[PDB]
Design a protein around this ligand. Structure first.
Ligand SMILES: O=C(O)CNC(=O)C(=O)O
Ligand SMILES: [Mn+2]
Length: 347
């Protein structure tokens, strides 16, 4: 009875069917949900994502360690700045023969990196987002941000803890409390984009997608879980995403680092955009750089994978979709462990 969740559910389903079709050569079944079917921009964006993701599953680098063991050496707040600690990790967890060809060339083709037991650590999807959707995001960010976009970070979530309120109940993000403010407006401008990124997540880690949606369901229906539940409810009704949170990072370069808030096993999804030509995402553990230009998507275990992105020759923003495990705890949903790549093929 919550149509936004039902739309991202169908977007996930129909994109999976598109991928299964590309793999089998049999016509895929269209969605009868005409929020998708009658929306040419979202529909063709799902086609494009299907091509890129199918390209990525066919191009898999393996590191010779597991995510479990890597996670075990990690100190609770090992964000990547201790260079000595990082060189010790790097010896204990080297790139391996499939990756550490001497000095690495920059990747441009879609690909993924899986651990020793087939878990997806990193998924690189260049040009995964159609120009039309990138233009929707360009407009939304534009009107929100007014060098030509004022730098900064801005965070949105229907259920959240502000810094200093950790031990109270969670509630609407301050940026989203004004019902006609900048925040809500921004969310209202981007449901097609949100729906796309959530569908991509389903293709990479279906259980995590449906856990997230389950959590949003429970936060909607169960009032005793949050402050200001009326505002929580209104925001969930325009929350076209399975993620706990969305963060817009405008005109900022990013040092090589690890996230340390968020579950050690959560997969974030970054979408980069703007008008610049020399984007590069750096992953030292994988001995790799990845071309990182507007419309690129990267999914990654970001509390595990060191990643950074240098200054570029233009305006740039990044949309970062991520997780708060405490919301899972509060909603009675265990947080799932990272999916294996074969799960993509279990039809
Ligand atoms: O620079 C970017 O596009 C991505 N940002 C991050 O991973 C982060 O803030 O943790
Ligand atoms: Mn990050």
């Amino acid at each position: 009875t919550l149509p936004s969740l039902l739309l991202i559910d169908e977007a996930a389903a129909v994109l999976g069917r598109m991928i299964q079709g590309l793999r089998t050569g049999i016509p895929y079944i269209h969605t009868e949900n005409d929020s998708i079917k009658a929306n040419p921009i979202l529909r063709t964006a799902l086609w494009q994502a299907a091509y890129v993701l199918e390209k990525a599953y066919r191009r898999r680098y393996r590191v010779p360690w597991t995510a479990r063991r890597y996670m075990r050496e990690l100190t609770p707040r090992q964000d990547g700045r201790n260079a000595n600690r990082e060189a010790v990790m790097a010896k204990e967890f080297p790139p391996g023969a499939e990756l550490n060809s001497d000095h690495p060339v920059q990747e441009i083709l879609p690909a993924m990196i899986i651990d020793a037991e087939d878990h997806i650590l990193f998924c690189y999807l260049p040009s995964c987002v159609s120009p039309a959707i990138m233009t929707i995001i360009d407009a939304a960010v534009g009107t929100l941000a007014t060098c030509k976009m004022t730098p900064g970070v801005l965070t949105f979530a229907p259920a959240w803890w502000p810094v200093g309120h950790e031990n109270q109940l969670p509630g609407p993000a301050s940026t989203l409390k004004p019902p006609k403010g900048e925040g809500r407006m921004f969310l209202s401008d981007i449901p097609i984009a949100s729906a796309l990124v959530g569908a991509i997540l389903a293709q990479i880690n279906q259980p995590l997608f449906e856990s997230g949606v389950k959590v949003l369901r429970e936060l909607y229906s169960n009032s005793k879980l949050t402050k200001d539940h009326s505002t929580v409810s209104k925001i969930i009704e325009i929350w076209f995403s399975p993620f706990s949170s969305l963060s817009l990072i405008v005109n900022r370069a990013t040092p090589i680092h690890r996230d340390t808030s968020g579950p050690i096993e959560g997969m974030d999804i970054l979408v980069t955009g703007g008008n610049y030509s020399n984007g590069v995402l750096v992953t030292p553990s994988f001995n790799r750089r990845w071309t990182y230009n507007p419309g690129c998507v990267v999914a990654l275990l970001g509390k595990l994978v060191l990643h950074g992105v240098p200054e570029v020759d233009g305006e740039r923003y990044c949309m970062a979709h991520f997780w708060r495990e405490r919301l899972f705890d509060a909603a009675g949903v265990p947080f799932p462990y990272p999916s294996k790549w074969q799960e993509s093929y279990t039809n």
